[PDB]
């Protein structure tokens, strides 16, 4: 159980945006409000649970185009709204060419690979996210953890050298492929290359 925390995934950033001291969910970001209204609060309480029990490392030909951010709509929860092709989702501001510290939730820890992909130049978030819009840029095998599994703020951590020559909006998609299970996790992070 986990999705990306830095650059944060849609469900993670939306749950941070909605978080209140009583546990009520009150987002101010409009894409987050829309996703709450469509798919429900359960998605944000379970922001880490974007999973397909049977994916088994499969991607194109199995996870339909336009459904990556909800694990093909095969999870135990409704994450369908987190596929909305909108440009107003919360996003992380990045510098093209910089190496950044990546954090991925270890809400429940598992052995495996993190397959990290970046949308191609020219792709923008008002378009459908398909496999042919993504390029595999890194695979991270069994990275280390900071914080115990199931504790607030706990995460896997590794470095990512961001490609040069990029600008404007993009998305980083990660597939967490367990080595001990067919269960995989699906993570989508809105970013913009406007730094430096």
Q: Tell me the binding residues for Cu(2+).
A: 1, 110, 183
Considering the complex, state which of residue 85 and residue 108 has its C-beta at the smaller distance from Cu ion.
Answer: 108
Tell me how far, at minimum, the Cβ of 107 lies from Cu ion, in Å.
Answer: 7
Tell me how far, at minimum, the Cβ of 51 lies from Cu ion, in Å.
Answer: 7
Q: Report the C-alpha gap between 111 and 143 in whole angstroms.
A: 9
Tell me how far, at minimum, the Cβ of 170 lies from Cu ion, in Å.
Answer: 27
Q: Report the C-alpha gap between 133 and 65 in whole angstroms.
A: 10
Considering the complex, state which of residue 1 and residue 115 has its C-beta at the smaller distance from Cu ion.
Answer: 1
Considering the complex, state which of residue 45 and residue 131 has its C-beta at the smaller distance from Cu ion.
Answer: 45
Tell me how far, at minimum, the Cβ of 61 lies from Cu ion, in Å.
Answer: 25
Q: Which residues bind Cu ion (CB under 5 A)?
A: 1, 108
Considering the complex, state which of residue 51 and residue 118 has its C-beta at the smaller distance from Cu ion.
Answer: 51
């Amino acid at each position: 159980h986990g999705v990306a925390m830095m650059p944060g995934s849609r469900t993670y950033l939306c749950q941070l945006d909605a978080k209140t001291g009583t546990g009520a969910l009150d987002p101010t970001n409009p894409a987050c409000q829309a996703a709450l209204d469509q798919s429900g609060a359960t998605a944000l309480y379970n922001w880490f649970a974007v999973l397909d029990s049977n994916a088994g490392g499969r991607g194109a030909g199995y996870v339909p185009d336009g459904t990556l951010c909800s694990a093909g709509d095969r999870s135990p929860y409704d994450f369908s709204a987190y596929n909305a092709a909108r440009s107003d989702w919360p996003r992380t501001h990045l510098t093209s060419g910089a190496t950044i510290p990546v954090e991925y939730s270890n809400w429940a820890a598992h052995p495996g690979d993190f397959r990290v992909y970046l949308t191609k130049p020219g792709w923008s978030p008002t378009s459908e996210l398909g496999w042919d819009d993504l390029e595999l840029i890194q695979t991270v095998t069994n990275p280390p953890q900071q914080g115990s599994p199931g504790t607030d703020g706990g995460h896997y951590y590794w470095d990512l050298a961001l490609p040069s020559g990029r600008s404007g909006d993009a998305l980083i998609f990660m597939q967490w492929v367990r080595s001990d299970s067919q269960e995989n996790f699906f993570s989508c992070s809105d970013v913009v290359f406007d730094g430096g």
